Amino acid sequence: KVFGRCELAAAMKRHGLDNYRGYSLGNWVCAAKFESNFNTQATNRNTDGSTDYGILQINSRWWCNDGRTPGSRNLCNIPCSALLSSDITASVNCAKKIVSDGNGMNAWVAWRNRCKGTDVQAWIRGCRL
Ligand code: NA
Ligand SMILES: [Pt+2]
């Protein structure tokens, strides 16, 4: 599913990401734009053999089981395919564990490099939230 910007903002808000660990909703919408282009089906292979999955590009190295990342962890206790659903619940629930783990949104390379320190409130402008 490719979300619209305000459509994703509404879903992320409903699932409790606005101000989650102090990150405003615009931070999460910006992170999903640059991680996945708002596409729940996005997948990208990492150099270490792991893969990033879904609208927030969650890594099989630590967070999910994809059956091809040997020696890895599954800290969200899910198959990585759960992170590709049109329903973002599994991605949002897993993102909450990631952002809680001590590095905050720096875990998302695209957030660090393209969102951090920018006018992230622009990402929710015009939306009826
Ligand atoms: Na894993
Ligand atoms: Pt939820």
Curated annotation (Swiss-Prot):
Residue ranges annotated for the C-type lysozyme domain, each copy included: 1-129
Gene Ontology cellular component list: cytoplasm; endoplasmic reticulum; extracellular space
A GO biological-process term: cell wall macromolecule catabolic process
Reaction catalysed by this enzyme: Hydrolysis of (1->4)-beta-linkages between N-acetylmuramic acid and N-acetyl-D-glucosamine residues in a peptidoglycan and between N-acetyl-D-glucosamine residues in chitodextrins
Keywords tagged on the record: Allergen, Antimicrobial, Bacteriolytic enzyme, Disulfide bond, Glycosidase, Hydrolase, Secreted, Signal
Binding site for substrate: 101
Alphabetized GO MF terms: beta-N-acetylglucosaminidase activity; identical protein binding; lysozyme activity
Main location: secreted
Protein purpose: Lysozymes have primarily a bacteriolytic function; those in tissues and body fluids are associated with the monocyte-macrophage system and enhance the activity of immunoagents. Has bacteriolytic activity against M.luteus.
Protein name, entry field: Lysozyme C
Organism field: Gallus gallus (Chicken)
Gene that specifies this protein: LYZ
